[PDB]
Amino acid sequence: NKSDAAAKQIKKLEEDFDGRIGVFAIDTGSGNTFGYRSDERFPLCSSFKGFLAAAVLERVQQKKLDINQKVKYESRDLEYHSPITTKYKGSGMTLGDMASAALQYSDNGATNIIMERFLGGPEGMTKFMRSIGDNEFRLDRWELELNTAIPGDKRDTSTPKAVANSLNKLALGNVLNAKVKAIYQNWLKGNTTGDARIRASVPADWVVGDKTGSCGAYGTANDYAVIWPKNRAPLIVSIYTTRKSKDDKHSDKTIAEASRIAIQAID
Ligand SMILES: *C(=O)N1C[C@H](NOS(=O)(=O)O)CC[C@H]1C(=O)NNC(=O)[C@@H]1CCCNC1
Numbered sequence: 001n002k003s004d005a006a007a008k009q010i011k012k013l014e015e016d017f018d019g020r021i022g023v024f025a026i027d028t029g030s031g032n033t034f035g036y037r038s039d040e041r042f043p044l045c046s047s048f049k050g051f052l053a054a055a056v057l058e059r060v061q062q063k064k065l066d067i068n069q070k071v072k073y074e075s076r077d078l079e080y081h082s083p084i085t086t087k088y089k090g091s092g093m094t095l096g097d098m099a100s101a102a103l104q105y106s107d108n109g110a111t112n113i114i115m116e117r118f119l120g121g122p123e124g125m126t127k128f129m130r131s132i133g134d135n136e137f138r139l140d141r142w143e144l145e146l147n148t149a150i151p152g153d154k155r156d157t158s159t160p161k162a163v164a165n166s167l168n169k170l171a172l173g174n175v176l177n178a179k180v181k182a183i184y185q186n187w188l189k190g191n192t193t194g195d196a197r198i199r200a201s202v203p204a205d206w207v208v209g210d211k212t213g214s215c216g217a218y219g220t221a222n223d224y225a226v227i228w229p230k231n232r233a234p235l236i237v238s239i240y241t242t243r244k245s246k247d248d249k250h251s252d253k254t255i256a257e258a259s260r261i262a263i264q265a266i267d
Pocket of ligand 1: 045046047081105106144147193211212213214215216217
């Protein structure tokens with residue numbers, strides 16, 4: 001009834017945007033879901049960095065790593081879009097601080113360093129997501145190569161549904177204890193890069209945690225979020241987009257409106 005109209009609306013949106021929109025939303029109370037192109041592949045871009053942080057936290061909780069471990073990198077020519085690591089260089093950075101920088105500011109120096117030293121490369125990141133029962137996610141390349149967003153290229157992709165399921169397991173399920181889960185949620189709540197996406201679609205009084213991606217090619221951009229409405233149980237929203245040609249720009253507005261449509265569908 002509302003699920004029907006919604007599919008109608010996303011389709012129109014998609015035609016208006018001249019591209020592909022993948023949505024999966026969960027209301028964790030009613031168990032209700034909504035899905036449009038939900039098992040199609042879309043590029044991850046930066047969005048996997050949210051899953052990266054959870055992988056570090058899991059190691060932390062098994063006491064293979066200490067969250068306060070200093071990591072040195074003064075000899076390293078930092079990658080593009082490494083805001084936090086650039087302002088810490090020469091002093092070391094705690095493991096937890098690197099992870100949260102990756103997540104909340106999408107810092108590519110942080111991401112690469114974590115994958116190189118602690119997580120066993122893109123293959124390691126893929127291993128982690130399999131371990132939580134995500135069979136769709138794959139990470140094949142490093143920053144920044146992984147942002148090529150070539151249509152029909154399967155490297156560095158997942159599905160909207162898979163992302164949403166995995167986000168639910170990590171932020172809401174039993175992969176992390178009470179303590180480390182709250183840390184992970186606080187990181188997600190302090191993401192600085194999603195104000196015009198999922199965040200722009202909800203009441204200001206709802207708490208949102210989110211992770212964005214913007215490949216910068218084929219107008220590919222995304223956002224996934226845990227939303228805490230008050231007097232109601234958490235929602236999961238997963239919004240992925242790509243466009244026809246290489247030069248096409250991404251659209252924040254489209255993601256906000258797609259988010260809004262997804263949310264109404266799961267009242
Ligand atoms: C991740 O997707 N990133 C890093 C950064 N933060 O993104 S987001 O706010 O989380 O969405 C912004 C861009 C993106 C990334 O680095 N992708 N590629 C580029 O930015 C290249 C720079 C030159 C032209 N586009 C490709």
